[PDB]
Amino acid sequence: ILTVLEQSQVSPPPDTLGDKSLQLTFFDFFWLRSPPINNLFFYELPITRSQFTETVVPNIKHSLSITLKHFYPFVGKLVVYPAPTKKPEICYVEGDSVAVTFAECNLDLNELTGNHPRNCDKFYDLVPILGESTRLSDCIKIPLFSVQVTLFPNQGIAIGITNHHCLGDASTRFCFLKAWTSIARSGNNDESFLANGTRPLYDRIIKYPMLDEAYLKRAKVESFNEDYVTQSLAGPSDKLRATFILTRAVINQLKDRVLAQLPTLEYVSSFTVACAYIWSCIAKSRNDKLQLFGFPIDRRARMKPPIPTAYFGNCVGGCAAIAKTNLLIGKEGFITAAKLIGENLHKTLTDYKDGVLKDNDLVSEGMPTTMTWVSGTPKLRFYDMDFGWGKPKKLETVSIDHNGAISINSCKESNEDLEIGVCISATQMEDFVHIFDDGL
């Protein structure tokens, strides 16, 4: 359904990069045991098999190769040592390559790029496995980045990108993809990138070794080698994937509702209101007991002192809210959700300002019967990633299927609209669609 056309390995150009390391911080160590991240970029273009083979295949290989010489960790590996004392790091060694799979899919592309419920498992063989680990005497090596480029004959192309979270955050991914696409768009040339582009900063400017040591202990690095197993998504499943739109106009209406009912709520944004609304739908859909809802925060600009945008690696925080489900249901529920999110976010941002870096409580206070964590930052415009065929028709974060997660991104006919991706069982999707639509 699924035909593998080529299994390739792509390296930086000959004689450009030597052996290189990148040292990691607690921001990176926090992700040691995370599952891989899987992202899809769908493009519409009337491409034949012969054309795909003739120009697309060599173009992908060539442009990625060039990009890799500026982004060495993308072709490196995560190396974790059993010694409690030798810290994990990213190592690139000459000879290291990125696995790039070229494939062909016989599904109708129009059945995948829509926003209505589609089987979550139809997407798994569009995203590459992270890749097998290398086990040596002194250490384990884990691939950080893999790619699949899938032809939909006469219809278009899906680019599947799988990465390890230790490689970097959304911002790092964004920086890489800007460079790669620029290099691609401009005919496999890094001239325009070197002149006008944003280059990664590898300077190790986050220096908190006591935090480093504490985060590693938490992520149990001593048993990592023995514990670590691959975590690829595989069907079959009854779950359905859908995309929900919150337009600028609807967001502003919801926001006015919040500001009018809660005139002294200290934090209200498009994003908190969107979260509030979807949180409320999830509460009505589950009809459970107690819920947690949270999302990541890019901390670069809130660090003391601030961290340049171009900083390579993770610099992410998070904010969470917990409420009884009964309090989150209905028109009033959305208001309560917005209140709680806004208060917790205000507190979290206040903490960062004061320089606070850190942050089984639930066994005591109460176990949530639903936990939801947002994958995504609407601020980063992945919808503009153009390899030369134009902007993507559809983005999907496929790794939300693994756990309590939804995706939130900007749209991209409009950067002020929001797209929310959900993968849930078929029984719940029916009601969820009505809940989301009717509440608007």
Residue with tokens 């970097």: 168
89-92 vs 77-80, strand pairing mode = antiparallel
d(CA 118, CA 17): 43
What's the sign of the alpha-carbon dihedral 396, 402, 406, 408?
negative
Active site residue 359: no
DSSP 383-439: GG--SSS-S-SEEEEGGGGGSSEEEEEE-SS-TTSEEEEEEEEHHHHHHHHHHHHHH
Q: Identical fold at 1-233 and 234-440? A: yes
Tokens representing 124 are 């798994």
Return the structure tokens found at 29: 């160590």
CA proximity to 421, closest of 398, 393, 438? 398
Fold observed for domain 1-233? Chloramphenicol Acetyltransferase (3.30.559)
Number of neighbours of residue 138 by Cβ within 10 angstroms? 9
**Domain covering 234-440 assigned CATH 3.40.920.10 in the classification:** no
Separation between Cα atoms, residue 200 and residue 12, nearest integer Å: 16
User: Is 311 among the annotated ligand-binding positions?
Assistant: no
Q: Which H or E run includes 189? A: none
What three-state secondary structure class fits 313?
coil
Dihedral of CA atoms 219, 165, 235, 153 in degrees, nearest 10, equals -170
The closest of 183, 172, 185, 147 to 380, measured between CA atoms, is 172
267 marked as part of a ligand binding site: yes
What burial letters (b/e) apply to 332-364, b meaning 16+ CB within 10 Å?
A: ebbbbbbbbbbebbbebbebbeeeeeeeeeeee
Q: Identify the sign of the CA torsion 160, 166, 168, 169.
A: positive
Residues in the chain: 440
CA distance 369 to 295: 18
Domains in the chain: boundaries: 1-233, 234-440
Which residue out of 384, 386, 402, 431 is catalytically annotated? 386
- The DSSP secondary-structure symbol of 55 reads I
Beta-carbon contacts of 125 under 8 Å, excluding residues fewer than 6 positions away, are 1, 2, 103, 105
Question: Is position 379 annotated in a ligand binding site?
Answer: yes
Q: Which residues fall within 8 angstroms of residue 409, CB to CB, at 6 or more apart?
A: 376, 377, 378, 382, 383, 395, 418, 419, 421
The Cα-based distances of 38 to 176, 231, 274 in angstroms read: 15, 11, 23
Catalytic residue among 96, 164, 165, 417: 165
235 labelled ligand-binding? no
Q: Residue for token digits 């066994």?
A: 363
The encoded tokens of residue 427 equal: 């029984």
Q: Is 386 a catalytic residue?
A: yes
| Contacts of 287 by beta carbon, 8 Å cutoff, 6+ apart | 325
Establish whether 170 is an annotated binding residue: yes
